[PDB]
């Protein structure tokens, strides 16, 4: 109850890959400050999921209920749980 997870999060090319984790810090900054951030992969290839942990339960349990599906304007929405 102190962490968040997202789904349908593919990688992107250069000049934008940074934005992927950067925008995470900006969007989640209104609820508090993120302390833990992990971006796993499959055989060194394109991921689809990430793992973020907050310094408090009230940040995670809030963020999940505030950022439920990001609007990246691509194809399919995300699922923050």
């Amino acid at each position: 109850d102190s962490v968040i997870v997202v789904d349908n999060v593919p990688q992107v090319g250069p000049d934008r890959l940074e934005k992927l984790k950067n925008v995470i810090h900006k969007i989640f900054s209104k609820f508090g400050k993120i302390t833990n951030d992990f971006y796993p992969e499959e055989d060194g290839k394109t991921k689809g999921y990430i793992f973020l942990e907050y310094a408090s339960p009230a940040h995670a349990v809030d963020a999940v209920k505030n950022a439920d599906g990001y609007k990246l304007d691509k194809q399919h929405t995300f699922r923050v749980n």
């Binding site: 969007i27 950022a67 929405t77």
Partner: peptide, 11 residues
């Protein structure tokens, strides 16, 4: 990331 629309959080 910058001063633009929050196109990363569906209300």
């Amino acid at each position: 990331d910058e001063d633009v629309k929050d196109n990363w959080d569906d209300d």
